[PDB]
Design an enzyme around this catalytic site. Structure first.
Site, PDB file in Angstrom:
ATOM      1  N   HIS A  41       0.805  -1.212   0.000  1.00 24.89           N
ATOM      2  CA  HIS A  41       0.000   0.000   0.000  1.00 24.89           C
ATOM      3  C   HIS A  41       0.840   1.264   0.000  1.00 24.89           C
ATOM      4  O   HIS A  41       0.263   2.355  -0.078  1.00 24.89           O
ATOM      5  CB  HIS A  41      -1.014  -0.006   1.161  1.00 24.89           C
ATOM      6  N   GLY A 143       3.307   6.111  10.424  1.00 26.91           N
ATOM      7  CA  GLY A 143       4.691   5.930  10.038  1.00 26.91           C
ATOM      8  C   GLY A 143       5.280   4.574  10.387  1.00 26.91           C
ATOM      9  O   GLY A 143       6.385   4.265   9.936  1.00 26.91           O
ATOM     10  N   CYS A 145       4.083   1.519   9.542  1.00 25.26           N
ATOM     11  CA  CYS A 145       3.865   0.436   8.589  1.00 25.26           C
ATOM     12  C   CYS A 145       5.201  -0.100   8.102  1.00 25.26           C
ATOM     13  O   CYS A 145       6.161   0.655   7.894  1.00 25.26           O
ATOM     14  CB  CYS A 145       3.016   0.915   7.415  1.00 25.26           C
TER      15      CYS A 145
END
Ligand SMILES: O=C1CCC(=O)N1c1ccc(F)cc1F
Ligand SMILES: [Cl-]
Ligand SMILES: [Cl-]
Ligand code: NA
Ligand code: NA
EC number: 3.4.19.12
Lengths: 306, 301
Positions: A41, A143, A145
């Site tokens: 993503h 932040g 991920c």
């Protein structure tokens, strides 16, 4: 003496964390050999995330659209492809700090260490369990991920989790390192509820053995029970079923402490039906279920990972 | 979202852990630049446990009596000295993995990460606090002496604790990296007992602020309190006194949540009176006191 929620030493994984930027999005990647792994993503705008076509979004990207920084050094991306929900960025340099590692998919009830990262920089380490409902009760901010979860066997890092998103109840969902989600979730900006969770019975028992080893014995009693009888109790209290393999796995602790699993099961039955009566166990007023039998044995035996 | 007991990443400290052997005793040392730090009781024999004279034991040792192993490498000891309760072995190699570091003596209530080690190899990492009675509630087995506690600010490691011994209640005592013990303890096996321990009030209040930040308000009430009335109540529950320093330190969290510090104290007073009545706060059924105000701001940002 003592019993603490303990993570694995994180050094071997710290040497693998990098920063991945695509457009206005920065998150974390895992650099192993000459590939950087991160959530697919990363390539979406916020409107893309509403209903993403990832293959279509990716075709439009060049290698130079992916800025990867390992500390202060840029890495040159020379290839890019997707495996399930994980983007694989081929780079021109193998990570000289690559540890001995495997990708493993864990089972609900198993525990692992999470290395929380931001902008490619490790910020904290903590221990998690994969819940029965396939979420983890993590601590992640925007932040984070691409932060990863792992175990260490001898000198081999077994990577088992990559962080992707937060659910509306504030628990967390992610994938294995082959991009397969844990649980019935999809990488799309939509509200997606976690199912009702249950308590990990074999782990509660392991923690009660940990308590006994550490001198906390007030909940022991003269009684025993049967699997069938105990499992009716478990179902009533939204505990996971206890299987014979769970009993076998707890064998060592039963032999070391003199408390058979079904003997300990009778302790747990009484705790479920009556409560703690103002007492604590290993400093907790709740029954703790994020230590596995192996965790207890390892911490009460001093196994190391140099 | 979420709130976890979180340790600092341990890699910077892992690269400093070595094994120190003297006679039949093996424990851990911390290798920084060309010095290895370890507890001085590594030189004790079985007859030296109650009243060791460390100066007399040390003068009898040669550099080559100390075996220091870093990974699979023997380091060469070229000097030794004692500083308070810590031995400093000079070695002929500077540790190439030495991080930016400092030594910092902490106050009760402060938190730090512990890298538990055995035979110079790291085992696990967890979070601790310096209790008001100058002990820590750790997880340490035989062979863990010399394991260290630390924080990391930016990329600088502050070493604040070296493990020396376990007390009869199962709690732990050690020194700063200048070798001065926390609390009244000594490196002798003569009978010692920790003082009665108390709850770290400012940390509980920080953690209640964390709960509000993460979206939980059930425990608040319409009341306030004076600082003195709060302290009169809380000490009846074996809570530490809350000082004006503590009130000032909680300013930022109060401003972020819109809940005045003495209003949060009123909430705490009611929780001590009522219990949780079957509810939890950040996943706990007890009030948590090993998160500092600084920890909460770093974790909730
Ligand atoms: O973006 C995502 C992915 C997972 C999920 O459930 N959500 C979400 C959507 C809307 C919300 F209000 C809260 C959310 F957590
Ligand atoms: Cl019976
Ligand atoms: Cl609790
Ligand atoms: Na029993
Ligand atoms: Na080592």
């Amino acid at each position: 003496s003592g019993f603490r929620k303990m993570a694995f030493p994180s050094g071997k994984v710290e040497g693998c964390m990098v920063q991945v930027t695509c457009g206005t999005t920065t998150l974390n990647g895992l650099w192993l050999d000459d590939v950087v792994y991160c959530p697919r993503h990363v390539i979406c705008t916020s409107e893309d995330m509403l209903n993403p076509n990832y293959e279509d979004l990716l075709i439009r990207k060049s290698n130079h659209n992916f800025l990867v920084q390992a500390g202060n050094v840029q890495l040159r991306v020379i290839g890019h492809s997707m495996q399930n929900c994980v983007l694989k960025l081929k780079v021109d340099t193998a990570n000289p700090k690559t540890p001995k590692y495997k990708f493993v998919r864990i089972q609900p009830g198993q525990t692992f260490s999470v290395l929380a990262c931001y902008n490619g920089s490790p910020s904290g380490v903590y221990q998690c369990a994969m819940r029965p409902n396939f979420t983890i009760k993590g601590s992640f901010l925007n932040g984070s991920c691409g932060s990863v979860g792992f175990n260490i066997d001898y000198d081999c890092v077994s990577f088992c989790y990559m962080h992707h998103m937060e659910l509306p109840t504030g628990v967390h969902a992610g994938t294995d390192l082959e991009g397969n989600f844990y649980g019935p979730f999809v990488d799309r900006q939509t509200a997606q509820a976690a199912g009702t969770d249950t308590t990990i019975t074999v782990n509660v028992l392991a923690w009660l053995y940990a308590a006994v080893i550490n001198g906390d014995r007030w909940f022991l009693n003269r009684f025993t029970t049967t699997l069938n009888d105990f499992n009716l109790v478990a179902m009533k209290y939204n505990y996971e079923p206890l299987t014979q393999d769970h009993v076998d796995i707890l064998g060592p602790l039963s032999a070391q402490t003199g408390i058979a699993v079904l003997d300990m099961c009778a302790s747990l039955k009484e705790l479920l039906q009556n409560g703690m009566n103002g007492r604590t166990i290993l400093g907790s007023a709740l029954l703790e279920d994020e230590f596995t039998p192996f965790d207890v044995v390892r911490q009460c035996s001093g196994v190391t990972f140099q």
